[PDB]
Amino acid sequence: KKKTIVTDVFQGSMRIFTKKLPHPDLPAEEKEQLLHNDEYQETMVESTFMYLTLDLPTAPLYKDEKEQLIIPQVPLFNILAKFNGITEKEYKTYKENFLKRFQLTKLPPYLIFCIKRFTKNNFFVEKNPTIVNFPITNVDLREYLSEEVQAVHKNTTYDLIANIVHDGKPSEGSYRIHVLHHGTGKWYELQDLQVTDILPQMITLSEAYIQIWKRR
Amino acid sequence: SYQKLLKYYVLNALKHRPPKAQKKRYLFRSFKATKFFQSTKLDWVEVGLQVCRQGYNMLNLLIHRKNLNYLHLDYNFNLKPVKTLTTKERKKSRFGNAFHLCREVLRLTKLVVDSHVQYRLGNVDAFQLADGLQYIFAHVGQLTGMYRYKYKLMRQIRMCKDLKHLIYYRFNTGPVGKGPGCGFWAAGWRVWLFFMRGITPLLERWLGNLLARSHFDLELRAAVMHDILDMMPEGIKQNKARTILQHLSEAWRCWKANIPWKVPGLPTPIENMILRYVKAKADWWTNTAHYNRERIRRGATVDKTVCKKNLGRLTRLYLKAEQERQHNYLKDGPYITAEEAVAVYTTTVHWLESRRFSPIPFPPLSYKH
Amino acid sequence: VPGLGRGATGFDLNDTNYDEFNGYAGSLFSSGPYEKDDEEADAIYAALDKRMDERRKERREQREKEEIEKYRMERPKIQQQFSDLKRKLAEVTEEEWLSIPEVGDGELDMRKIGQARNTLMDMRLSQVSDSVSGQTVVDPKGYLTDLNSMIP
Amino acid sequence: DIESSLKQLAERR
Amino acid sequence: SYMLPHLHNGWQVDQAILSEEDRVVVIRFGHDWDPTCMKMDEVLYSIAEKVKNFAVIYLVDITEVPDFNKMYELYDPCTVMFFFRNKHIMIDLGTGNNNKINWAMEDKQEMVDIIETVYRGARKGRGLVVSPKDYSTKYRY
RNA sequence: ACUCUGGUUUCUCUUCAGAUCGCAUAAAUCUUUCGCACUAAAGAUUUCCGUGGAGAGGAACAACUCUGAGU
């Protein structure tokens, strides 16, 4: 019985119109042969995306004229636009260039997004400090939804309900949760055993790791 | 000796990995199928003498075909240099540890074969032959001298010594006291047969090969330079390679000092490659600095240059981390909340008022002290 | 011409070509003296060696290939590292590959929230500090003006 | 110039 | 990299030794494959633009030109030797001999000081220049 | 108690075998482990030392004692 409470409340449908590339080290004829022989074809492999791993871009590791603060900010819309149909993504699979492209077929009532802010370097495991400029009042994913059923989803105005930020160094790090409480409007930030009050503008300041938004 | 034998048995038992499934190919039967081999039947003494002669001939071929005619191999398989030689000839006289081990094994085999021949030539009695075999197997590390060729054989030598001690102390009891007549040599024979069977693949591979027919920064810089040069045309590789190297150096020095590297006149793929190289070098440098700091804290052996380089890298990393922390403090604002700060200020004011501490004024124009 | 022309003297036995195990590299038998009988003997010997090496050859080869494939996940060659960049790097045109200069020559306002918080905290503290009893203050105008009242 | 020598050295390592 | 032009031909290297007389000629007989010779080349590049006005450093490959490794007997993986106006100056390192450095000197300042001392000794004509270093030990603690 | 496919020995090849494949016991490489590794342990890998299973082919001499089977 796949229609579980969790599967119905926090799991959605994504239609990954994914493809592959023939070869980087081949001429035009050999590449076109695989492009036409379904060896580099585009296929729809629509699955159930319980969590949308919106990947943040790596820090430029270089200063600029603007950005008085040296923390590279990033808008949520640009971050979440990767999952849209137009934005193609490449996967460095073994002996292949899996150039794919995703598309959200159906949105869950409570979308859960977990930005992978921590990666592994060639000799260590660094955490990307880029901030996610995510408005926490109203947002719509219809600008990144699939064109086939764009009008099928009547409601698209989703608002963030809870954010969990992992502050500190990767090895020694603290896990704080900034949750927007219902009943009232205050988005309280809760430590392990300390409950504080966080300003809504300050919620979008701390680097979030896992976010859960209510589609209203 | 008994404890050492028990240790060897327990080691051979705990490591009893069951054998693997081979294809059951017989090397001896394969060589028999080969047209370049004949078959006959002869006494073990004659075959041993023939094998000793063949081994001597093979050693002579290995020490003569290499034009190293300044040394001679004795009939006892103890190769001794003929006369003095120069450093060039000394390097030419380099005898590999595999060669030394093979020479020692051949010497032991020739000694055993000659002892058998003497037993079959009427030189000594059969009991004397057994005693000679016991001597040629136990307490034979001194005679063979194979320990220097391969240090690992010292374990087998100690096992043979323990077997000799046990056999002695058991047999030499009652009317038969201490003496040289102990002829029980099966144990040492088995030990040396096992050692030879283990050693055989390495020596065979060496003989077959003879007869035929930490630095991530420099490596990454060399790889990037090679890639750029191979991509660069011959019309631009005459003098602009130094320019590309200088640009890479500027990028490296830029990331190490928080100064942005801005080359707007450079190609976008060139900038991407430079940025990738800079990121790789930064990761390698950070890992190396962390490892060096850990080693220094633990108490590893370093030098003044290494200590200076590690201190510089650690200082640069600490400065970058402090800059990042200050930037985050500016971004995150004051960590102390307004209410907590007000409460702390009120407490300090109350404490000062209770102490009635008169504030220290600005230094007057005519201060006494 | 040899090095004798420079008039220099002292003060394949190289140390790199030499080693502890298996001694020095190279083959003691020169590859020159071969023949058709040598070809036949070498073929027979190689066939015998290959036959005697095929016991676990298939399983060993499969396991080694799997291990190499696994190690390819964590062991990228320096060349492989820049391979993706080097492939795209060839797209730079001749003008792009010649204009390379010599190396000798809405939005997020992160500081805004910090400044606002600092201003609020300072205002709150000053409101608290306005309740102080006897905090002193020496006017810089008076002190500087009266600084030269005792000058030579 | 140095590009050929660098490529030769890299190809052997 | 290896910006120092390696004299491929042995006779070319000998002529290069006879080319400059008023400066110091240092030939790196190390094979460019080994990492030790790579570190030696890096150290040379550190002093490439410094000792240039007083010295002319060239690389060498014992595989390319073998006569140098067979007559001078440079068997080390990367041996640094000097020749001044057809006179191979000896550096009093204290390692038993003085024909080569034989050590991957990772200190640029030490190499610069050694080059300066070698130049001073060559100017003074001393065939065995007293190296201002305790090279007989590892110089580490 | 009548009859019946059914002999062992030995040589060779292929293939499988984690069963104490072997009531025996080695070698090498990497990895982790404290060194500062013959004198040391752990994990893995590989090659030998030589086997058992089955199949296939070959040449020697037993032809039904035997046993299973067709009474």
Q: Tell me, letter by letter, the H, E, C secondary structure of chain A.
A: CCCCHHHHHHCEEECCEECCECCCCCCHHHHHHHHHCCCCCCEECCEEECEECCCCCCCCCCCCCCCCCCCCEEEHHHHHHHHCCCCEEEECCCCCEEEEECCECECCCEEEEECCCECCCCCCCCECCCEEECCCCCEECCCCECHHHCCCCCCCEEEEEEEEEEEECCCCEEEEEEECCCCCCCECEECCCCECCECHHHHCCCCCCEEEEECC
Please report the residues numbered 71 through 100 in chain E whose beta carbons come closer than 8 angstroms to any beta carbon of chain B: 73, 75
d(CA B159, CA B3): 11
Contact C100, B243 (CB under 8 A): yes
Angle at A140 between CA A138 and CA A142, to 5 degrees: 170
The structure tokens listed for C31 are: 């590859």
Instruction: Give C99→chain E minimum CA distance, Å.
Output: 22
Contact B334, C117 (CB under 8 A): yes
Distance from CA(C60) to C1'(F56), angstroms, rounded: 27
Find chains touching chain D: ≥3 CB pairs under 8 Å. Answer: B, E
Closest CA to A88 of A137, A27, A17: A17
d(CA B132, CA A104): 88
| Cβ of residue D10 closer than 8 Å to a chain E Cβ | no
d(CA B22, CA B219): 42
- Does the CB of B155 sit below 7 A from strand F? yes
Nucleotide nearest to C51 (CA to C1'): F13
d(CA B46, CA B298): 64
Closest CA to B273 of B228, B216, B222, B240: B228
Distance from CA(B204) to C1'(F40), angstroms, rounded: 28
Q: Which residues of C touch A64 (CB under 8 A)?
A: none
Tell me E27's DSSP state.
E
Q: What is the stated resolution of the deposited model, in angstroms?
A: 4.1
> Residue E25, SS3?
strand
User: E2-136 in CATH: which number?
Assistant: 3.40.30.10
**Other beta carbons less than 10 A from residue B40's beta carbon:** 5
**DSSP code string of B74-115:** -TTS-EEESS---HHHHHHT---HHHHHHHHHHHHHHHHHHH
* CA separation, residue A152 to residues A80, A83, A112, A148 (Å): 21, 19, 21, 9
Contact B155, B170 (CB under 8 A): no
* CA separation, residue A22 to residues A36, B97, B212, B313 (Å): 10, 52, 43, 44
Name the residue facing C23 among B21, B95, B228 (closest C-beta). B95
* CA separation, residue B139 to residues B52, B144, B151, B210, E97 (Å): 22, 9, 16, 32, 43
d(CA E130, CA E128): 6
Tell me B259's DSSP state.
-
Backbone angles phi, psi at A167, to 5 degrees: -80, 155
CA C51 from centre of chain: 45
| Residue entry with tokens 């010649």 | C98
CA B314 from centre of chain: 30
d(CA B271, CA B251): 9
d(CA A182, CA A177): 15
> Residue E82, SS3?
strand
Task: Enumerate the β-bridge partners of residue A12.
Answer: A49
Angle at B78 between CA B76 and CA B82, to 5 degrees: 120
* Residues 3-22 on chain C lying near strand F, CB distance under 7 A: 21
Closest CA to A59 of A142, A132, A161: A132
End-to-end CA distance of chain A: 26
CA B329 from centre of chain: 49
CA E13 from centre of chain: 13
Instruction: Give C2→chain B minimum CA distance, Å.
Output: 18
> Residue E56, SS3?
strand
The structure tokens listed for E67 are: 């006569």
The structure tokens listed for C1 are: 């011409």
Counting one residue from D and one from E, how many pairs have CB atoms under 8 Å apart? 14
| Exposed/middle/buried for residue B263 (C-beta within 10 Å: 0-12, 13-18, 19+) | middle
Distance from CA(B54) to C1'(F38), angstroms, rounded: 31
Name the residue facing D9 among E3, E5, E33 (closest C-beta). E33
CB contact under 8 A, E6 and D5: yes
Cβ within 8 Å of residue B334, ≥6 positions away: B341, C114, C117, C118, C121
Q: Which residues of E touch D12 (CB under 8 A)?
A: 33
Alpha-carbon radius of gyration of chain A: 20
Instruction: Give E90→chain C minimum CA distance, Å.
Output: 9
Backbone angles phi, psi at A13, to 5 degrees: -115, 125
Angle at B79 between CA B211 and CA B185, to 5 degrees: 95
Q: Indicate the pairing of strand A73-75 with strand A131-133.
A: parallel
Cβ within 8 Å of residue B353, ≥6 positions away: C133
d(CA B344, CA B331): 24
Q: At what angle do helices B216-231 and B240-255 cross, to 10 degrees?
A: 140
| Exposed/middle/buried for residue C82 (C-beta within 10 Å: 0-12, 13-18, 19+) | buried
* Coarse DSSP helix, strand, coil percentages of chain B, rounded to the nearest 5 percent: 65, 0, 35
- CA nearest to D6 within chain E: E1
| Cβ of residue D9 closer than 8 Å to a chain E Cβ | yes
Closest CA to A161 of A143, A177, A145, A175: A177
Please report the residues numbered 277 through 306 in chain B whose beta carbons come closer than 8 angstroms to any beta carbon of chain A: 278-280, 282-284, 286-287, 290
| Exposed/middle/buried for residue C56 (C-beta within 10 Å: 0-12, 13-18, 19+) | middle
CB contact under 8 A, A71 and C110: yes
d(CA E72, CA B35): 51
Q: Indicate the pairing of strand A110-114 with strand A210-214.
A: antiparallel
Task: Enumerate the β-bridge partners of residue A214.
Answer: A110, A159
d(CA E111, CA E44): 8
Considering Cα of B52, then B55, then B59, then B60, what sign does the dihedral take? positive
d(CA C91, CA A26): 16
d(CA B21, CA C58): 11
Closest CA to B184 of B247, B133, B112: B133
d(CA B72, CA B79): 6
Name the residue facing E68 among C3, C7, C16 (closest C-beta). C3
Contact E37, C14 (CB under 8 A): no
d(CA B165, CA B304): 54
The structure tokens listed for E139 are: 């110089």
d(CA E43, CA E59): 12
Contact A49, A16 (CB under 8 A): no
d(CA C99, CA B28): 71
- Does the CB of B21 sit below 7 A from strand F? yes
Backbone angles phi, psi at A120, to 5 degrees: -115, 125
Tell me B273's DSSP state.
H
Alpha-carbon radius of gyration of chain E: 14
| Exposed/middle/buried for residue E76 (C-beta within 10 Å: 0-12, 13-18, 19+) | buried
Name the residue facing E71 among C1, C3, C15 (closest C-beta). C3
- CA nearest to C75 within chain A: A122
Cβ within 8 Å of residue E54, ≥6 positions away: E23, E24, E115, E116, E119
End-to-end CA distance of chain E: 33
d(CA B345, CA C121): 12
- Does the CB of B31 sit below 7 A from strand F? no
Find chains touching chain C: ≥3 CB pairs under 8 Å. Answer: A, B, E
* Largest distance between two CA atoms of chain A: 65
Backbone angles phi, psi at B326, to 5 degrees: -65, -40
Q: Which residues of C touch E127 (CB under 8 A)?
A: none
Q: At what angle do helices B304-332 and B268-298 cross, to 10 degrees?
A: 110
Backbone angles phi, psi at E80, to 5 degrees: -100, 120
| Exposed/middle/buried for residue B258 (C-beta within 10 Å: 0-12, 13-18, 19+) | middle
Tell me E66's DSSP state.
T
